[PDB]
């Protein structure tokens, strides 16, 4: 029905819980909304390939895992205590990827806002990976997302497959960016608390 709309909804939940006394966040509620944000890169075509494994499918495969671990804090010590936080397909290290995502696509968001009256999504796409995903990637796959943006769908075309218009799309994008804004802190704190760095 009104996908934004689910987006801005998961997420403000997650942000209420970040905000609230001794928090904890479940790992089912948490993929399930990493999940709903999923589809947005495919919406954004080829320039975002490279999201169907670095984000998407790590989203899959938390929501997966999700059946057997209770909180993200509860999920991370268990990999500090096994020491096998960098280890390929390790439940930190997903998290790690995810986190990634929600902050493009809150970049993109915020963009999106600040760039209102202009009919493209280049700059606010570009500005997005730029900032978020370039730093992770090899030149080879950021030459590859550079040729992509020209297949960027318009902004009317965007909004019309999120089924919004400009009004109510710029609330629950500018509600994403919120609610997003604490999650995403409260994670690197995850990792940074537990000098775990943030940028493997
Ligand atoms: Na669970």
Redesign the pocket.
Known sequence: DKPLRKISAAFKKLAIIVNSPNPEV???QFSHACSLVSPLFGCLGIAFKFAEMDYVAKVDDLVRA?????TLVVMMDKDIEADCVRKAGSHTRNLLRVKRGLDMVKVLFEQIIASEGDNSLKDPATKSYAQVFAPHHGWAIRKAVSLGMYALPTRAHLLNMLKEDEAAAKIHMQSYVNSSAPLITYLDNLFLSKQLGIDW
């Open positions: 479940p790992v089912t999700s059946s057997s671990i209770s």
